[PDB]
Each structure stands twice: as structure tokens, then as C-alpha cells.
């Protein structure tokens, strides 16, 4: 065993199984703890006279014979720890009136003999928790009067009889927390005065125990987790001077008007959950308190005398509860976080907050402000967290909030002026209702919550000035030539073939197409290089609405038309349905009609991006407007495919090869033409496949209006009946 | 009542790490939370790392990953260990005892009953 | 006092004490384990034996004779260990098979089984 000079021999760990040998006659501490010792003989420790530390922990130790402790009348500590020891030694510990500290606490201790702790009267601090106990000892605790701390920590303790700690006049601490506790009988607590700390913390109490009105100077006290859930009226009259209480997560429904008064050293009070209590903690007399909590309960005002009061309040959380109006919060120097959320408060008035040096965190999220005043947030000079998210807004102060460091804006969809950077000089995390308003920041570096990207563009609505001559001259060439084709076919006031007619009405939807990508790019040409401040506008307002009914109506019409249009050619070539055939293009018109209104029906459909296409969409959404209508056009395009394949099996005259072949081109250039768009549409359905979104929507606008600018080009340069049509028309001018 | 005697930690330049060990002499009760506090010189204390009887451990965000709290409950020690020392680390250090609570500990230094003597880190860029 | 040890019966002898002290008995130690109490007799003559180990043998005592006579019959291999005799003179304790409350203990004996 490995010695040392101090007379503090160190014997852990040797693998001994009995007491060392050939040691110094005398010795003051002795540290056989790890060495697996089975039992003490008669006498083992006769060799040691002068011994008053005693270290064995650790070690399986099962017998200790009643006079192997004989002749240590000098020892003060004896640790006997993590041993089998199913019962405590009453006669082995006997004789030792000396000794101060007794730790019994990793055995297996389930019986305690009544004769224990016998003879000792100098004994202070006494361990038996983590052992097996039904009952608390009463006779052999009453034994020891001069104990000033007890642990009876984590035994099976079920509950705790009268006059249990009667005689232990000069205890400090007691410790009962982690056991089965129940039922505390009202004096169970009598005579154990100067308890300073009391821990019943994970016991099963229903009921708030009334016997700690018996301890007069009590600084601690733990009922953590249990099951209280009233807490009455001078709960705690008979401790005015304890600093601690620990309720935390048990379930509260009441707590009582006058629960925590005139306790002038309660230092936090922390309520969660009891949603029963209406009236503010009538607080007076708690001055010292520096953090209050408040549950999610009916609690509507607030006392005006908060701050005149509670000089060294640092936090306040009042939070889920009801609150509608706020007192003047000058004062409270100290205070540095106020939580209000999810409370009911209509307006922010100018003294609300004045003062309130070293305000550090704000929160008001989830409230119903409507108003706030222009210098509401003057006064407040660190404030560096403003959380007003959901609150329903309409304009924000800028002044006085310089030093944010973080600022939350997230549900105020009625906010949407810009708010300007320059007085923001310190952000670092943004969150605003639009993307429009955020990209004024750019990205110190500020993060903003919703991404600007490209669907959101601030600089520029269609992008690069390739796109933008594109955009324009598609615009143009469609305008002009649907309406020459409208012209050149509607102003013979004749005799309409079928087949005439439906060409007029296809460049009918796609003249209207064309105003459709003329007024997207007039905007862009208007709103070129500063389209932060249109966008916003844009989009709420119906000049996004009406953009996107123009263009969801004359895609669907045009595609109508056209499945119309197969199926009179297949008639015709089958073998006088001028009437039935106008009545089904009316029809068609009006099923693009409802198809481009059900979105105004819809919520949001067309707020998605400016260019307010609403099958276009994002990953999110998916939404079942527009995946119903691309599936719709690609049916569509399957049966009239199918039907005139069949046409070409039952075919294999010369006007009527002209029209199948004018309409085959129609049909082969509106298919290429909505086959990427579609594809694009269908794109976010699937997490594998990843497309930029400047390209998609680059090919979207050059893709979409690209049928209805190309049709009319070949209905006038490849069809031989324009030329008749257009020499009519001379005919009937001149 | 615990003595909670604490010793370790000296002049040391910046860039370095520094050990602080706390012993407890009295009751030394293994099942409470344990935490260290530093006091700035003409600020107040500040909790910095806080651990339960379990062994969850908090920290507070200036020294989250930078220090390290560890609790010997066989010995009756707790310790602190810091690596790379800025010069705004130079303050005195408490360790601080409490009741049983298994909470991640709150780091107001009203919730400790136990205080030490505090020792002196002085961090010299 | 002194205590000595001497189907197989055996008695502990003790002429220690002046009076026959109540709450005294029998145990028996595992190799390299705790003891546990086989049986104990009060001085009234209450027994009490444990609920597993009861069976044909049974604890007997007499002031006169000063010697405790156990004896066991139809033993079985897994009963055998070493038996000690213990004995508890100062009064104030509950009766009971632990070895906490007893004063003084004897050298124990051996047994074998057939």
C-alpha cells in the first residue's frame, strides 16, 4: 500500500480483501475503499488507535463484527458508501461518540434497527438516500440531537408520520426529494426549527402541505415536481424569510390573490400553466424580487405600481395570458427583457415605454397592435431584440431603434411601405411580411427571412435585355398580327365556315394573350431599375388579378379552340353544324372563363410572382388548381392527338388538306410549346431534379405567350384562304 | 453547508488554457447543480457554466464551446477547464453549490445558497 | 461471553452469560457472501425461520442445558455452508434474522452433505 508523510495512508485500489498490515502504529485517515473486502473481523482496526478517518466505500462489504470498530474513540469520519450493508450496524457503530460524519447511503439498506445511532452525540451530517427505505426512522433520528444535515433522499418513502423530526432540534437541511412521498401529516414538521432548506422535490404530493408553517427560518423550499395544482392564501406565512421556492413543472390551476406577499426575500417567482387565476399576485411587500413569470391564464391588466414597486425587477415574462392594456413602464432601470406574447394589446401609446435604460430584448409578437406611436420607441436607447411578428400592423417607427441588432416583422401582411436601411444601421437578422421590403437591405451581412431569389425581383420584373426585347417584340408581332387576322376574317360579314370561324376565335385568345405580356411589359418598362416599390403594389393590388385571368383565360381558350377545331376536321373529313358548333365555342370560351376565375375565388393564387402565372408555382405549395389544369391540357393534348392520328389511319379535297394541314401545325407547335411549361410546372412535385429559377422563369415568359405571337404568322403566311380573304377585304374597301 | 474551497488559475497570456478545480469540504451533498461565476472588474456576476447531478451541462453564450464544466462526485471536486483565453476573460471565478433541482441550472446567482472565495484570471494580451 | 460449536445436529454451548439473553440464533455464511439467519428463538420461546430455508429442522433452547441444539434431516447439497450462533444480551431491539442487532458471534463449523 502506497504511504504518505501526513499520516494519511492511501490504500484505494490495492485489491486488498482485509485490513492492510505492517502499517504505522498510529495513522488519522486510512483510504481502503476500492479493495474488495468481504467482511471486518473481531478487531481488525486494533492496530489503529489514533484513526479519525475512515474511508470504506466503494468495496462489497457485507459484515461488519460489532467490535471491529472497538477503540476509535478519536474518529471523525467514517464513509461506509457503496457496500451490500442490507441493514445499518447498530452495534458495530455503537461506541464511537466521536465521529461527525456518517455517510450509509449506496447500500441496500432496508431495515434500520431501533437501537441504531446509539451512544453518538457529536454526529452532524448523516447520509441514507439511495437505499431502500419504506418508513422514515424515528426513534434512532431522535436519538440524534446535534444533527445538522440529513439526507433521506431516494428511498421508497411513502409518507411522513407526526413528530417525525422532533428531536432533531438543530438541523439545517433535510432532503426528501426522489421518492414515493404522499401525505405529510400537519405536524410532521413540528420541532424542526432553523431548517434552512427543504427539498421535497420529485415526490407524488397532491395536496400543498400546511406542516411547513412549523419552520420558522426557511430559505429553500423544492416541491418541484408533483402534483399540486392549488397553492391557497398564506401559503407561506409561517416563512418570511425564504429566497427560494421551486414549483416548477407540476400542474397549476390556482395559485391564490395574496400566495406570495410580504415575502421581502423571494427572489424569483415563476408561475407556468395556471390558467384559473384571474387577478395580478398582489406583490406588495415583495420588493426584492428580480424575475417574475406569469402563466398562460386571465390575467387582463396590470398593476400601475408595477415599477414604483420592485425596484430590481430584471425580467418580466407575462406572455400567453390576456393582456389589453399597458401601464407606463417608466422606472424599472433595471428591467432588460419584457415578453408579451400572444396577449391582446390594440396599441403601443408614447409613454408606454419611456425610460426603460438597459431594455435589452422587446417582445410583442402575436398581438393585436394596430397603432404605434411615432416615438413610442425613442426613449429606448439598447434595445437590440424587437420581436413584433403577427401583430397586424400597418406603419413602424423608425426612431430610436438604431441599435437593433435583430428585428421581427413576419405576420404584418397590412404592412407594406418600404422601410428604409438608413436608419437600420446595425441588423443582423431581419424578418419582413414581403420579400420586396427586404432586398432594400441587400444581404454586415443581413439576413432576411424571406428570400428575395428571382421570382421576387426588385431591379428588374423580366431580367436581362435579351428577354426584354424578346418579351416586346413577341408582344408586338401577337398584337399586331392577331389583330390583322381578325380583322381580315370577321370583316367579310358573310357566310362563316367552321373552320374560318375557329381560326378568328384562336386569334381572338391569343390577341388577348398578347395585351396579356403587353401590360407585363409595359409595368417592367415603367418600373425599370426600381420595381422594390411596385412589387408589393403589384401584387396585392387586382392589377396582378386581372393580369392573370388575361393570361390563364386565353391559354385555356386557345387550347379549347383548338381541341374544337380537331374535332370539326375530324367531322368534316367524316363527311352543317354551324349552330352547334358556335354554341360548343361558347361553351369553351366559358369554361376558360371559370377556369381563369376560379383562382379570384381561390386564396392568393396570383400573389405568387409578379408575373402573376399561377401554375407556375413553387416547391410548397403544389397546389390543386394548377396541377388539375396541367393534367387537364395534357389529356387534352393526348385525345386530340389519338383523334387525328386516327384521322390520318382512316385518310390514307384540296382546301380541306389545306385546313388539316394549317390545323396539324397548330396543334404540333402548341404541344412543343406547352410541353416545357408544364414540365417546369411539375418540376417542384419531385425533390430529385433542381432548376434554377432565373432560368425557369426566363423560359416561362419567352414559352408561354410564344404559341399565341406564332399562330397568326402562320395562318397569314401559309394559308392560300388568307389570300382570298385579304383580296375580299381590298375589294370591299375599294 | 459545504466549504466549497476553490484553487487553480494565474496569470496566462491569451491563446492559452487554464484549469480551475473547487473542492468541497462540509456537507458535499453530490446531487445538486454546481456552476461557476465570473465577476468582471466593475461589472457584475455572470454565470458561465452551470451542470446537474445527471451531468447535463449549460453554458452561457459568450464561452458555449469554450469551456468545459465537469463534475468529480467521487472525489467531491468540480472543475473548469478554458481554452484560448482572450484578454476579456480576465475577471474573478466563484464556484457556487445549490439545492437539488435537475433543471438546466439557472444562471442567476440568486439561485446558489453556497458561494467560495473566488480566484483571480488574469488573461494579458 | 463465549460461544463454541460442537441427519446432523449441532449445539453452541455458551456459559458466558449469567442469564440466557433473549433474541438468539442461528447463521449461515455463503463463501465470500453475507450471512443470513437460518433461525433465532426469543426468550419467551418465540421461533422465526426463513420462508425458503424452512423446513425439517428446527431451533431448540434450554435455560438448564445452556446449549442450542439444531438438527438438520434429509439435508440437501445446496444447504451446505458454515453455521455461526449468535447472541444478543442489552435489551430495547426488535427480534429479527439480521446480523446488525446481535452482540456476539462463535467460530462456526463446517457440513457436509450425503
Not at chain 1, 452532524?124 to 440524534?144: A, G, I, K, Q, Y
Not at chain 1, 423544492?222 to 400542474?251: E, K, M
Not at chain 1, 398581438?367 to 403577427?390: C, K, M, Q
Request: hydrophobic residues 40%; proline residues 4%; charged residues 15%.
Amino acid at each position: 500500500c502506497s504511504c504518505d508523510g501526513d499520516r494519511r495512508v492511501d490504500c484505494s485500489g490495492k485489491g486488498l480483501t482485509a485490513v492492510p498490515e505492517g502499517l504505522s502504529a498510529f495513522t488519522q485517515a486510512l483510504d481502503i475503499s476500492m479493495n474488495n473486502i468481504t467482511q471486518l473481523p473481531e478487531d481488525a482496526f486494533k492496530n489503529f488507535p489514533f484513526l479519525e478517518e475512515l474511508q470504506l466505500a466503494g468495496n462489497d462489504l457485507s459484515f461488519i463484527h460489532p467490535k471491529a470498530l472497538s477503540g476509535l474513540k478519536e474518529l471523525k469520519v467514517l464513509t461506509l458508501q457503496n457496500n451490500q450493508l442490507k441493514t445499518v450496524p447498530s452495534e458495530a457503530i455503537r461506541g464511537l461518540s466521536a465521529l461527525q460524519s456518517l455517510r450509509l447511503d449506496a447500500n441496500h439498506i432496508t431495515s434500520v434497527p431501533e437501537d441504531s445511532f446509539e451512544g453518538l452525540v457529536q454526529l452532524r451530517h448523516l447520509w441514507l438516500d439511495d437505499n431502500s427505505l419504506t418508513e422514515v426512522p424515528v426513534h434512532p433520528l431522535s436519538n440524534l440531537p446535534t444533527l445538522q444535515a440529513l439526507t433521506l433522499a431516494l428511498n421508497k418513502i411513502s409518507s411522513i408520520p407526526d413528530f417525525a423530526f422532533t428531536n432533531l432540534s438543530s438541523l439545517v437541511v433535510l432532503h426528501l426529494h426522489n421518492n414515493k412521498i404522499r401525505s405529510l401529516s400537519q405536524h410532521c414538521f413540528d420541532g424542526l426549527d432553523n431548517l434552512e432548506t427543504l427539498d421535497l422535490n420529485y415526490n407524488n404530493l397532491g395536496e400543498f402541505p400546511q406542516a411547513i408553517k412549523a419552520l420558522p427560518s426557511l430559505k429553500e423550499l423544492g416541491f418541484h415536481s408533483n402534483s399540486i395544482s392549488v397553492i391557497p392564501d398564506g401559503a407561506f406565512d409561517g416563512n418570511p424569510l425564504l429566497r427560494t421556492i421551486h414549483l416548477y413543472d407540476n400542474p397549476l390551476s390556482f395559485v391564490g390573490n395574496s400566495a406570495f406577499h410580504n415575502l421581502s426575500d423571494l427572489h424569483s417567482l415563476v408561475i407556468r400553466g395556471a390558467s384559473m387565476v384571474q387577478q395580478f399576485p398582489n406583490l406588495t411587500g415583495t420588493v426584492h424580487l428580480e424575475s417574475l413569470t406569469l402563466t398562460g391564464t386571465k390575467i387582463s391588466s396590470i398593476p400601475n405600481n408595477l415599477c414604483q414597486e420592485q425596484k430590481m425587477l430584471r425580467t418580466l415574462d407575462l406572455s400567453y395570458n390576456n393582456i389589453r392594456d399597458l401601464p407606463s413602464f417608466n422606472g424599472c432601470h433595471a428591467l432588460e427583457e419584457i415578453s408579451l406574447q400572444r396577449n391582446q394589446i390594440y396599441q403601443i401609446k408614447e409613454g408606454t415605454f419611456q425610460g426603460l435604460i438597459s431594455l435589452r430584448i422587446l417582445d410583442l409578437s402575436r398581438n393585436l397592435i394596430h397603432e404605434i406611436h411615432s416615438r413610442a420607441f425613442a426613449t429606448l436607447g439598447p434595445i437590440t431584440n424587437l420581436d413584433v411578428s403577427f401583430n397586424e400592423l400597418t406603419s413602424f417607427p423608425t426612431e430610436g431603434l438604431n441599435g437593433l441588432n435583430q428585428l421581427k416583422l413576419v405576420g404584418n401582411f397590412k404592412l407594406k411601405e418600404a422601410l428604409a436601411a438608413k436608419d437600420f444601421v446595425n441588423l443582423r437578422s431581419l424578418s419582413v411580411p414581403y420579400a420586396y421590403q427586404c432586398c432594400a437591405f441587400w444581404g454586415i451581412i443581413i439576413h432576411c427571412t424571406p428570400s428575395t431569389g428571382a421570382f421576387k425581383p426588385c431591379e428588374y420584373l423580366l431580367g436581362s435585355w435579351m428577354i426584354r426585347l424578346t418579351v416586346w417584340f413577341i408582344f408586338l408581332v401577337a398584337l399586331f398580327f392577331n389583330l390583322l387576322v381578325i380583322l381580315t376574317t370577321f370583316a367579310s360579314c358573310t357566310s362563316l365556315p367552321s373552320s374560318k370561324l375557329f381560326i378568328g376565335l384562336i386569334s381572338v385568345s391569343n390577341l388577348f394573350m398578347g395585351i396579356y405580356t403587353g401590360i407585363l411589359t409595359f409595368l417592367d418598362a415603367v418600373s425599370w431599375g426600381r420595381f422594390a416599390e411596385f412589387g408589393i403594389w403589384w401584387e396585392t393590388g387586382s392589377g396582378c388579378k386581372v393580369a392573370g385571368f388575361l393570361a390563364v383565360f386565353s391559354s385555356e381558350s386557345a387550347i379549347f379552340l383548338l381541341m374544337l377545331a380537331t374535332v370539326e376536321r375530324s367531322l368534316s373529313a367524316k363527311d352543317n353544324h354551324l349552330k352547334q358548333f358556335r354554341v360548343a365555342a361558347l361553351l369553351a370560351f366559358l369554361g376558360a372563363t371559370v377556369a381563369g376565375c376560379f383562382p379570384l375565388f381561390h386564396r392568393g393564387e396570383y400573389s405568387a410572382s409578379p408575373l402573376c402565372l399561377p401554375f407556375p408555382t413553387g416547391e410548397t405549395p403544389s397546389l390543386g388548381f394548377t396541377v388539375t389544369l396541367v393534367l387537364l391540357n395534357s389529356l387534352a393534348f393526348l385525345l386530340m392527338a389519338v383523334i387525328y392520328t386516327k384521322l390520318y389511319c382512316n385518310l390514307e379535297e384540296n382546301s380541306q388538306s389545306s385546313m388539316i394541314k394549317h390545323v396539324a401545325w397548330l396543334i404540333f407547335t402548341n404541344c412543343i410549346f406547352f410541353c416545357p411549361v408544364a414540365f417546369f410546372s411539375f418540376a417542384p412535385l419531385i425533390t430529385a431534379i433542381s432548376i434554377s429559377p432565373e432560368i425557369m422563369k426566363s423560359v416561362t415568359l419567352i414559352f408561354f405567350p410564344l404559341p399565341a405571337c406564332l399562330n397568326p404568322v402562320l395562318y397569314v403566311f401559309f394559308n392560300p384562304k388568307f389570300k382570298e380573304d385579304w383580296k375580299l377585304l381590298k375589294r370591299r374597301v375599294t | 453547508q459545504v466549504q466549497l474551497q476553490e484553487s487553480g488559475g494565474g496569470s496566462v497570456q491569451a491563446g492559452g488554457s487554464l484549469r480551475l478545480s473547487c473542492a468541497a469540504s462540509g456537507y458535499t451533498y453530490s446531487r445538486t447543480c454546481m456552476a461557476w461565476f465570473r465577476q468582471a472588474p466593475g461589472k457584475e456576476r455572470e454565470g458561465i457554466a452551470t451542470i446537474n447531478s445527471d451531468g447535463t451541462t449549460t453554458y452561457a453564450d459568450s464561452v458555449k464551446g469554450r469551456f468545459t464544466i465537469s463534475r468529480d462526485n467521487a472525489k467531491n471536486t468540480l472543475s473548469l477547464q478554458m481554452n484560448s483565453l482572450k484578454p476579456e476573460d480576465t475577471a474573478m471565478y466563484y464556484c457556487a453549490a445549490a439545492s437539488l433541482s435537475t433543471r438546466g441550472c439557472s444562471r442567476a446567482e440568486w439561485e446558489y445558497r453556497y458561494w467560495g472565495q473566488g480566484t483571480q484570471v488574469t488573461v494579458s494580451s | 461471553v463465549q460461544l463454541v460449536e460442537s441427519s446432523l445436529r449441532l449445539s453452541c454451548a455458551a456459559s458466558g452469560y449469567t442469564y440466557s439473553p433473549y433474541c438468539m440464533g442461528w447463521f449461515r455464511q455463503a463463501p465470500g457472501k453475507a450471512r443470513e439467519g437460518v433461525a433465532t428463538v426469543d426468550l419467551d420461546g418465540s421461533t422465526i425461520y426463513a420462508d425458503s430455508v424452512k423446513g425439517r429442522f428446527t431451533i431448540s433452547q434450554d435455560n438448564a442445558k445452556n446449549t442450542l441444539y439444531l438438527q438438520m434431516n434429509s439435508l440437501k447439497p445446496e444447504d451446505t455452508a458454515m453455521y455461526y450462533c449468535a447472541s444478543r444480551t442489552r435489551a430495547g431491539v426488535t427480534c429479527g434474522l439480521n446480523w446488525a442487532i446481535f452482540s456476539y458471534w462463535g467460530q462456526g463449523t463446517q457440513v457436509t452433505v450425503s
